[PDB]
């Protein structure tokens, strides 16, 4: 129940994908972005916070993550903002695995899709909603459970 999300930009084919990981559940939220600008990041963040619970947002020092626009947005949304990888070993590990599972799942659906955006959606549902412990939780069910104990 921390709702700390770490964002980072990644490259696949050669599309730029913005990746947000909830460090407690390993839940991933990603979006293809055209260029690495604070304008793009601000849209991703607005969509993230629209759909999820975000108390703390973390990232590297990149100007698209530190620009006044981003800092202002987070202040507005009441979101704690920190920079500097790693936040901690626990979180970084969660993030790195997530990035690798995303690229795996992305590769798996790559050959059944035309656009990366469509592939990304299918990859996210797999990772978050389909993959989980035998008789256990998926990252979504984990996130859901801590979301519940906050929105009763």
Curated annotation (Swiss-Prot):
Integrase catalytic domain: residues covered: 4-147
Signal peptide: none
Gene source species: Bovine immunodeficiency virus (strain R29)
Highest taxon listed in the record's lineage: Viruses
Protein name according to UniProt: Integrase
């Amino acid at each position: 129940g921390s709702h700390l999300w770490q964002m980072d930009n990644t490259h696949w084919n050669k599309t730029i994908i913005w990746v947000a990981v909830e460090t407690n559940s390993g839940l991933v939220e990603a979006q293809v972005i055209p260029e690495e600008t604070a304008l793009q990041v601000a849209l991703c963040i607005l969509q993230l916070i629209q759909r999820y619970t975000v108390l703390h947002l973390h990232s590297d020092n990149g100007p698209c993550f530190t620009a006044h626009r981003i800092e202002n947005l987070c202040k507005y949304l009441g979101i704690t903002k920190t920079t500097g990888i790693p936040y901690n070993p626990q979180s970084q590990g969660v993030v790195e695995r997530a990035h690798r599972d995303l690229k795996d799942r992305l590769a798996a659906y790559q050959g059944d899709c035309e656009t990366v955006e469509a592939a990304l959606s299918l990859a996210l549902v797999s990772l978050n909603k389909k993959r989980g412990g035998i008789g256990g939780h998926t990252p979504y069910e984990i996130y859901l459970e801590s979301e519940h104990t906050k929105y009763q």
